[PDB]
């Protein structure tokens, strides 16, 4: 981890640099602050020194809540935070909602929790082929599933009751990415179910699986329905979106290869 | 349609006699009127016509001659800027125009030209601006002779009219024939004889009275008087 | 029983305010005569001002005045000018100056300020009063401070001075105004050189994009409203400035007529494209009679407009007789105003005998103030004919041939009459000259 | 040989102004200069004048205060007009001379008596301000009208070219309906521009190169049409100031007509000294960008006093000693507070906070911060309110109204939200220290 | 130095004696002054000191109190408008902080708080925008309690300034500490007391001595003083 | 020809017409002209109707001063005409001279006067070589001739006041073209000198050719200065001519055909 600590220590170095170059001008705190706020290169760094910090962070609590990646599933990991970091950089260029201290955040923020939520959903496939797992690591994943949910649902609450109170904004945007993640959240909760039955039972369950399957597919159907009804209603008000479209097609493919293996199954 | 006649109206009060001399004043002319705040009034109004010359025009003063020597003994002339010529006129002495040809740098050439030297019940009238008015004719000649009249020495009349705001001023400038040229004055002094005076029309005054119950005169031009006054 | 009548007179303003189309302006235009018809006095009045000038209702002058008579006897601050001004130019009634100036007066003691306006423009120019500078120049700036008032907050809205024919006095100061002239010229050369497509070669002007030249022209006119306001507004202070005391001395004579400019632009004059308008598509009849309201009030483009009008015997109230003396009337009103044409006009006027009696050396009189004032060279011709022929004046030849000369160089397009004046000129001295 | 003498230098004066007049190189100035120099060497006092206020304020010569004092001392005893008001400028502002007041004044009057109009602007400011003598509207009334009837005259004939006051701390009833319509067309002509057939990006490849067209006629377009509204507002203020005085429509009311007065005033001709000083302090010639600031200090702008005071603020200025320089940046700070700009206010908070020229004086930079909050809404200045109630400076510690400081704060402006929200947490955070050792 | 200190043009003419009392001259700060019209004048200037307080401050009128009572009896007090608030307050009686709410066409609530209720050689000095002035203060409190504090109740401190031209106006308020207020007052009695007057500066004056040959008033001064009283 | 009569008489009634309705509109003198000049449709008519006057009478001037054309110079004036037209209408926009119904008078009369020319030297070609020629064509030929020197001598003398008097303009081209017209007068009459000389005697003259080739020749250099003056001279004020470069062809074509000749001959 040395050049992670030196990547860092550079970093470090950098923004105190603005820091002092900053202070020197403008001898006080505010106007400090609000010429640091208001030049770009004081802005980029640090937004560069935030996105540092933010990968760390990210890299310890993958540390703690995962023991070890089984170097199988970065790739799709990288692919899905491509594609929404590309999904979110398109909704605050068509919302204009303009580059400012405080909704850049957001964005990074659900970048990382839809990482999160795609690391959850690969270690829950592959816990469900795992033949020796741990009752500490059972028992720290459902921490984590719950954690992660609550912490999005109150963000989607607290999202939800400013539209409201204020009107259609680029919010409700924000509120269906945090839906989708709860989605999500609950999907991995119906996944920890489906493995308590497994992991009880020393015989394979056909009926048992099928039935948990199915309904899996029916919730996450409904998701996809509501999620393109939210998406729908951009349309009548403001202009298109020309974004959200690619989720909106993996949605469908989901709900295709639902209806698929319910009609073979049948 | 008679634009030049001239009106004013007053309010001698609610007791009044129509005036006799000058215009009459007759009854079914007049006219009922009411303000914006209810006040009732009668007006009348003359004939307009401001004929005749009934003024009784008395003047045991000289003629006009001696009204203009003080001019002649002063010898204070004017001059008149024009398009090219400059024309320098003096009453009692001559009249001349002349031109200054500025050569570069030594020397100036003159171009000067003489149009005279000086060595009846009914009086005349001209028409100026459009207006009849009558004016006091003066003969003189032998100035500079033209080549256009066969070496004859130019003639031209100087026209008098008075102005309260002059300064033995010209007016303007025009000719009547080639090399005889006619030079109109602006003397202030010799209006002051009744005759040679401007031919001014007499006002006709208009009366509109104010029936009892309402103040003399209408309540919006006193307001109207006090903001003209301290503006 | 009169809340039915508001209510109409409410319904007809309301339709008239919020649709401009002819038939829902004549609608309200009914339902405000129907208002009018228990003698309610503000729709009445409405539908007054517009039954008598046309283009709204049937002209019908002796109903309006027959109206009018009631409406006097209300005493209606408006009703007393417009009976006034039929009065005055003799509209289809007997001519006399006094009651029109007893009508007018108290039409501007009720406080309208169309009435001050009269009051101070015939003050001004000593018509139906004698000539003077207090009574003019107060009753003038009684109605520029509401001009003003209504430039400020309105904008001031910019109307096209339009001629159917077509001390410090030089340019009543100097400095603002002629700022704002250099800036509406580059903002008009900026514009025109803008719709400049000729070098597009499949492109620039996005074939026929329309969209874009429309918001050029529109951006233009709205600048213009915004320079012309400011123009007013700096006219209005010079006036107030040259009037009272201050900044440059007493000086009544230069300005009375700048207050008289800013009254004139004011928003009086809009119905310039009503009669325009009614006069591009025949209907003679209402031309000189929304002309006569704003030649009333001063407006030289109205005067020179009514007059032209008259002179060729369209007007259908006046008779064919008295024609020709009211418009040698408004025309020398014209002239008092300083507009060139209309000296040319009233020369015509005494030279062929058009009203008054043929007499030359009037005609000469205003042939000659339009020459050297002006430098117009049509009434300087005719004058040089009058030297070539005779009229009036002695006869010789070598004046009229040097204001001819001076006829040449005096306009670039008189190269022509004078050298066809100058070989018969010199067809003449040369039979002449044979002849001797 | 006297009258030769001065025929000669009236001649070489004569040339010299000539040159001025129409050449306005750099060089061809400077050359002019000297030659003005030579005309002064044997006492032309026109020339005298005119080289005195290039050698003291250092526009177009090298600077030298010595000189011009020695040689203005003749200049007044003389008895010109414009040698006492830069005598009485050198003794208000301690310039190279023994400062005082009194002396400044009589000097002022006296440039006043003599005909001047920058000593009657001057008298005028200074008995608006009531700096040095009784604060009045009467005589402030006079010597800003008599200013004021030059500069409508001049500017009724020429338009009184345009000046925009730009600032160095901060860079470095009539006439609604005309702007709206003003900056309405300026709308429609940007949006007409950037319709057209992409302005921009265009297909581009090599460029067609046919040449823009439009940029400078418009620009030429705006400023004069900024110099004529300018025009049409100077002469409005100017109507409205005499009918306020004269009590023609409005009585008689002091405060309105001086005010208009002096707003009319600073827009004048002598205004181009502005840029004449900044672009002196650009090229970095700070003492040239002092001194042509302090006078029209003096004379009453609000941009040269924050000027000067900025200029003085950070040592830069060479001229006046550095034992001095905060006392006499202090004044200048004062003097643009109480005509309203808010950095002067809080720099003079500044200024009684850290102890800087005057001793520290925790109360009073209180106050002057508290003013700079209420009467201007300014963020920076409740911002510091916030912070001296926390750490309880100048009065009794409490920890909630600097809550309620912090968060209007906040409310005021969308520029403090960082700062706000960082104190606010190591407010939070010493709080609950504090409750925790509790 | 300073803006403090205020200066007069004065104009006695040739003949004129220093004053021995107030400020001092000496003969050494003369000034000789040429005008554009030729005129001599010898111009002279006070020493700008402005020291001590030897003004003679001897006066047996009444106590403060005296003052106070009749605007204390008036029962005629005044008001003020905040950006939220509205502190009205009546001199000796109380006051009264609130704000009134409206509802949507029933409901008006008004939110009272009360500031509270009433059942030495050196005058203490209270700084305001910068000036340093005398005041009477009336200590005060017993309001409604603030529970921030545990329900103390609250207390104000009414500021007593004078001012010639007043209307028993506040010109500022002011929260020391949370619950805790000061408000002040302005009133056009008080201050004829010795003390509580503005300390206002003495005007310096300079004499401009005319010298023989040349008149006491300058032609252009002599012109503009009746220019500005005939434009008055 | 009954056609050319037919549409001079269309364009006496096409400009009858327009005058009287300019009248109409107008009622006096000045003012139905101002409108004749400045507008179009109606300015147009006038000098079409000027150009067919001047055919006419050039027509009418060649039937008195000619019995009859011998249909071969035709076309050759026809050419003339054409050249000197193209020629006359590059000037006419070269110069910047503006539209004025003033000088197209002068350019008028210049073409009728070289078409008088070039009908001189044709008859003079064909004088040559003619037997039987009565005294009546000699003093018709004679007059021409001497009424074209005399008009060429006033223009000539106009032309050289007017540049000494004025200054350089339009009239200095002008006078070169009239010198260069008097020119070719005088080579016209020493041809029709030689040619009565040895009309007058019965036997042919060796010495007459000797004579027209030593005058051809002198004809030809004078041509050559004056062209090389008229370059220098338009080359030096003004702007660029880019005229009169093919008659300086056929000029320098002449002196070519007579110096070369004389020095194959001598
Ligand atoms: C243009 O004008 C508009 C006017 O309409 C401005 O509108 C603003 O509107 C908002 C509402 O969104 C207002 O915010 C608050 O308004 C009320 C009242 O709160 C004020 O008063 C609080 C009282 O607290 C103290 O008051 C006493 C004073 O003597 C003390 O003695 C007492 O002990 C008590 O402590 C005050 O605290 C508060 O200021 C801040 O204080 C705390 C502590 O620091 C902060 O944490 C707060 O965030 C607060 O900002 C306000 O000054 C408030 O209602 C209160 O009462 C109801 C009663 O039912 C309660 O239900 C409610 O919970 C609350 O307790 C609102 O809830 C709201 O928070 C704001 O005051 C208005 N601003 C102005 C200037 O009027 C608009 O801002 C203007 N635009 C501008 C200026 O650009
Ligand atoms: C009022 O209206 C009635 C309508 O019935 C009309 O007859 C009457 O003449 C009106 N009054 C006047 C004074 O005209
Ligand atoms: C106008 O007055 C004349 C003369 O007084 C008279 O003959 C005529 O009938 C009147 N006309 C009207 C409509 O009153
Ligand atoms: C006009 O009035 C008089 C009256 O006789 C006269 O000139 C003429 O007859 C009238 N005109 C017409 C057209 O009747
Ligand atoms: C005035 O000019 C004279 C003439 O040379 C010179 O000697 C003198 O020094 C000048 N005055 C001053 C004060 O320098
Ligand atoms: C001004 O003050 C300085 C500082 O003490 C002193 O040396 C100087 O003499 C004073 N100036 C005069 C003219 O006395
Ligand atoms: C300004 O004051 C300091 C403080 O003692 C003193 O040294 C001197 O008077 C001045 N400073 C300098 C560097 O001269």
Redesign the interface.
């Given at each position: 981890m040395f050049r992670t600590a030196v990547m860092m220590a550079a970093s470090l170095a950098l923004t105190g640099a603005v820091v002092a170059h900053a202070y020197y001008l403008k001898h006080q705190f505010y106007p400090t602050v609000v010429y640091l706020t208001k030049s770009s290169p004081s802005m980029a760094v640090l937004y560069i020194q935030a996105f540092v910090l933010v990968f760390l962070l990210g890299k310890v609590m993958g540390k703690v809540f995962f023991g070890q990646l089984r170097a199988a599933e970065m790739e799709h990991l990288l692919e899905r935070s491509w594609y929404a970091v590309t999904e979110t950089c398109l909704a605050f260029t068509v919302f204009r909602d303009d580059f400012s201290p405080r909704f850049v955040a957001l964005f990074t923020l659900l970048l990382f929790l839809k990482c999160f939520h795609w690391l959850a959903e690969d270690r829950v496939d592959f816990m469900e082929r795992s033949p020796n797992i741990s009752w500490l690591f059972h028992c720290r994943i459902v921490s984590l599933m719950f954690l992660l949910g609550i912490l999005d649902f109150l963000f989607v609450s607290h999202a939800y009751h400013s539209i409201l109170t204020r009107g259609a904004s680029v919010q409700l945007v924000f509120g269906f990415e945090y839906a989708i993640l709860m989605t999500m959240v609950l999907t991995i909760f119906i996944k920890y179910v489906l493995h308590s039955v497994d992991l009880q039972s020393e015989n394979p369950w056909d009926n048992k699986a099928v039935y948990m399957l199915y309904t899996e597919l029916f919730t996450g159907f409904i998701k996809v329905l509501l999620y393109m009804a939210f998406m729908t209603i951009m349309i009548k008000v403001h202009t298109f979106p020309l974004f959200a479209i690619r989720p909106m097609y993996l949605a469908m493919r989901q709900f295709k290869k639902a209806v698929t293996d319910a009609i073979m199954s049948r | 349609?008679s634009?030049?006649?001239?009106?004013?109206?007053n309010w001698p009060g609610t007791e009044f006699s129509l005036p006799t001399t000058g215009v009459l004043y007759k009854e079914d002319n007049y006219?009922?009127?009411?303000?914006?705040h209810?006040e009732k009034?009668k007006?009348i109004?003359?004939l307009?016509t401001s004929g005749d010359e009934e003024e009784e025009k008395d003047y045991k003063g000289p003629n006009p001659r001696e009204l203009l020597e003080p001019l002649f003994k002063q010898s204070s002339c004017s001059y008149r800027i024009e398009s090219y010529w400059t024309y320098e006129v003096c009453h009692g002495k001559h009249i001349r125009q002349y031109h200054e040809e500025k050569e570069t740098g030594q020397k100036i050439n003159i171009h000067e030209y003489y149009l005279g030297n000086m060595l009846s019940n009914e009086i005349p009238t001209k028409?100026?601006?459009?207006q009849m008015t009558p004016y006091y004719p003066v003969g003189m000649g032998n100035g500079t002779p033209c080549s256009?009249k066969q070496n004859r020495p130019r003639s031209s009349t100087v026209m008098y009219i008075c102005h309260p705001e002059s300064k033995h001023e010209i007016l303007?400038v025009?000719?009547?024939?080639?090399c005889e040229y006619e030079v109109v004055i602006l003397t202030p002094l010799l209006c002051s004889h009744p005759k040679y005076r401007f031919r001014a029309s007499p006002?006709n005054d208009?009366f509109?009275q104010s029936l009892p119950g309402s103040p003399f005169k209408?309540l919006?031009?006193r307001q109207?008087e006090q903001?003209?006054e301290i503006? | 029983q009169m809340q039915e009548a508001e209510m109409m007179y409410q319904t007809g303003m309301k339709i008239l305010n919020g649709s401009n189309k002819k038939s829902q302006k004549r609608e309200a235009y009914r339902y405000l005569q129907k208002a009018a018809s228990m003698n309610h006095t503000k729709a009445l009045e409405r539908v007054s001002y517009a039954l008598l000038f046309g283009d709204y209702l049937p002209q019908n002058i002796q109903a309006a005045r027959e109206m009018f008579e009631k409406l006097?006897?209300?005493?209606s601050?408006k009703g007393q000018t417009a009976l006034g001004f039929l009065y005055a130019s003799?509209l289809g009634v007997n001519?006399?100056?006094?009651?029109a100036?007893?009508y007018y007066?108290?039409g501007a003691?009720?406080?309208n300020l169309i009435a001050h306006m009269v009051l101070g423009y015939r003050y001004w120019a000593?018509?139906?009063?004698?000539q003077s500078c207090?009574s003019a120049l107060?009753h003038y700036?009684?109605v520029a401070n509401h001009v003003?008032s209504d430039?400020?907050?309105?904008?001031?809205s910019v109307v096209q001075r339009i001629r159917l024919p077509d001390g410090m006095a030089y340019l009543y100061?100097?400095?603002?105004?002629?700022?704002?002239d250099?800036?509406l010229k580059?903002?008009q050369?900026?514009a025109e050189?803008?719709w400049v497509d000729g070098?597009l070669?499949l492109?620039?002007?996005?074939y026929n994009?329309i969209?874009?030249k429309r918001?050029?022209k529109?951006?233009?006119k709205?600048?213009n409203?915004?320079?012309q306001?400011?123009h007013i507004?700096?006219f209005y202070?010079?006036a107030?400035?040259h009037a009272?005391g201050?900044?440059?001395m007493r000086s009544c004579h230069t300005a009375v007529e700048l207050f008289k400019n800013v009254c004139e632009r004011g928003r009086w004059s809009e119905r310039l494209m009503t009669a325009y308008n009614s006069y591009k598509d025949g209907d003679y009849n209402a031309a000189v009679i929304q002309y006569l309201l704003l030649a009333e009030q001063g407006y030289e483009v109205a005067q020179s407009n009514a007059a032209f009008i008259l002179d060729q015997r369209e007007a259908s109230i006046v008779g064919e007789n008295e024609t020709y003396?009211?418009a040698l009337?408004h025309w020398?009103?014209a002239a008092s105003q300083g507009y060139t044409v209309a000296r040319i006009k009233l020369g015509?006027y005494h030279f062929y005998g058009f009203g008054t009696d043929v007499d030359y050396?009037?005609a000469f009189?205003?042939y000659?103030?339009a020459s050297?004032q002006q430098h117009s060279?049509?009434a300087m011709?005719?004058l040089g004919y009058m030297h070539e022929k005779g009229l009036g004046?002695?006869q010789?030849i070598?004046?009229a041939k040097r204001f001819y000369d001076m006829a040449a160089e005096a306009s670039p397009?008189?190269?022509?009459?004078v050298?066809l004046a100058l070989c018969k000129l010199g067809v003449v001295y040369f039979l002449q000259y044979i002849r001797e």
């Open positions: - | 349609l634009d030049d006649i001239p009106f004013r109206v006219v009922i009127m009411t303000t914006a209810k009034y007006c109004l003359p307009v028409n100026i601006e459009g256009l303007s025009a000719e009547v024939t080639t006002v208009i509109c209408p919006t031009l109207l903001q003209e503006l | 006097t006897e209300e005493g601050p003799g001519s006399s100056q006094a009651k100036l007893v007066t108290f003691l009720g406080g000593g018509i139906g009063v004698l207090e107060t700036r009684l003003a430039i400020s907050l309105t904008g001031g100061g100097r400095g603002v105004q002629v700022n704002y250099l800036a580059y903002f050369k900026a050189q803008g070098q070669q492109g620039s002007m996005y994009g969209g874009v918001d050029y529109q951006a233009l709205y600048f409203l915004a320079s306001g400011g507004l700096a202070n010079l107030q400035m009272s201050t900044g440059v003396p009211r009337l020398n009103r015509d050396e009037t009189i205003h000659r103030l050297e060279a049509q011709f005719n004046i002695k010789d070598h004046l397009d008189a190269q022509v009459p050298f």
